[PDB]
Amino acid sequence: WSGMAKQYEPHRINIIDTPGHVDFTIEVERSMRVLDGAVMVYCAVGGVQPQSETVWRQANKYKVPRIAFVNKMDRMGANFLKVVNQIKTRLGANPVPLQLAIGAEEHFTGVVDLVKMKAINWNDADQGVTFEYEDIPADMVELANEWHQNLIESAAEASEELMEKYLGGEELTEAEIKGALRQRVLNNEIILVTCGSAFKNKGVQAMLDAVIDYLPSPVDVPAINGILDDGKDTPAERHASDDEPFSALAFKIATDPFVGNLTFFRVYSGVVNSGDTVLNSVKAARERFGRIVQMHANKREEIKEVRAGDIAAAIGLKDVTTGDTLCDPDAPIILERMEFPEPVISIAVEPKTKADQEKMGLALGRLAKEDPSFRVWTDEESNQTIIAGMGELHLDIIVDRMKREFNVEANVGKPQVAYRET
């Protein structure tokens, strides 16, 4: 990225999309830690919802600095400010609206910046490449300026003298504004809210410059601390700069037939290069490093080099799994992450064909490694395995994963409860 024609240096923003169901919520737990900033998506009409709040808590756990987008301004009943208030009062946040909505469902055309006090008015879904900025649409600037005042109200409290300077009757510049807000936004202070409809392609183009402009960079965000057998205070500061021994963090494991294993990882510190050696410092294992495939407009980008903060996926080695550290033999063995949600709904399971319980057991082995938020059980009553999952759907999209992945049909059932007698 670089900007909306207003652009400054292409930045490799590294992006991991997020799902919206708490059932597979480890995907939010790890991928909140792996994350530097956070885009709190929102329905401009739906507002905040049982998962907006759920993932908000998820985010709160990693204290991630989050700004919010309000998509779907074209659908009827969508209003940016309302959703803003929804967040502010359902989540207890300080939603500085660094933007504003020009229209609602029928007359949504642009976004009022409260600092440019201008409204870039793109074109629609494909053509929303028109970057014809427009100055102060008075219809909106009747109070867009006073919504800029809210923003200024948040930046003044950013520093001791900055508030006083704001009380000096003086305004703030295009850098002191962001840097004051950012310097703590990096530290998760207030959520900047911009409206748009990525379907209708407005708002999104700005919703990439405020990313660069406020979201912490791995250099703006505080340094992460590793862990060892004994977890120190800073057992190994693994700052962004890959000066540390290669020390990534592997968070996901994937599949490919022509590439084999497709493990994912965000490198916290250090640099591994197309064939190296690292240990499962968390598993006390070891192996080489062959064919990195960093994903950008994915063409099987079999990159021979992955560096600080550069999320990529590795092939081969042996074991890394979802929160397991990626470390050089120097091994800041552990990263604090040894957690994933516990199945809140367990259930017994057995194949359709009775001699497939061994294959459904192994399916559960694979599908248990594939996401950490899905346990497998094997009680001793008869034989039945208990697929302890997060949600009904969380472990029901794996009962069908055996049907899809492992071409086995299964009929689930309640676990047999241990009925002891006396």
Partner: protein, 70 residues
């Protein structure tokens, strides 16, 4: 919960909702979360932990005696 089996033992205020203690049987909690999501619009959770054992007249255990025979 009263409908389920849960015997109320206290409930308070927690933060935004309330934390609610009840030593509900384990049998009575096998999809609870799912039911809970539906009841609360997906906005509540429960944490259950086997504690002890007790009885409820259910010759359902007498039923499962008829296995590989009667």
């Amino acid at each position: 919960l009263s409908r389920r089996r849960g015997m109320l033992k206290g409930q308070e205020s927690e933060v935004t909702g309330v934390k609610i203690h009840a030593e509900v049987p384990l049998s009575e909690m096998f999809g609870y979360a799912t039911q809970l999501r539906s009841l609360t619009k997906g906005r509540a959770s429960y944490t259950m932990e086997f504690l002890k054992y007790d009885e409820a007249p259910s010759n359902v255990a007498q039923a499962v005696i008829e296995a590989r025979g009667k």
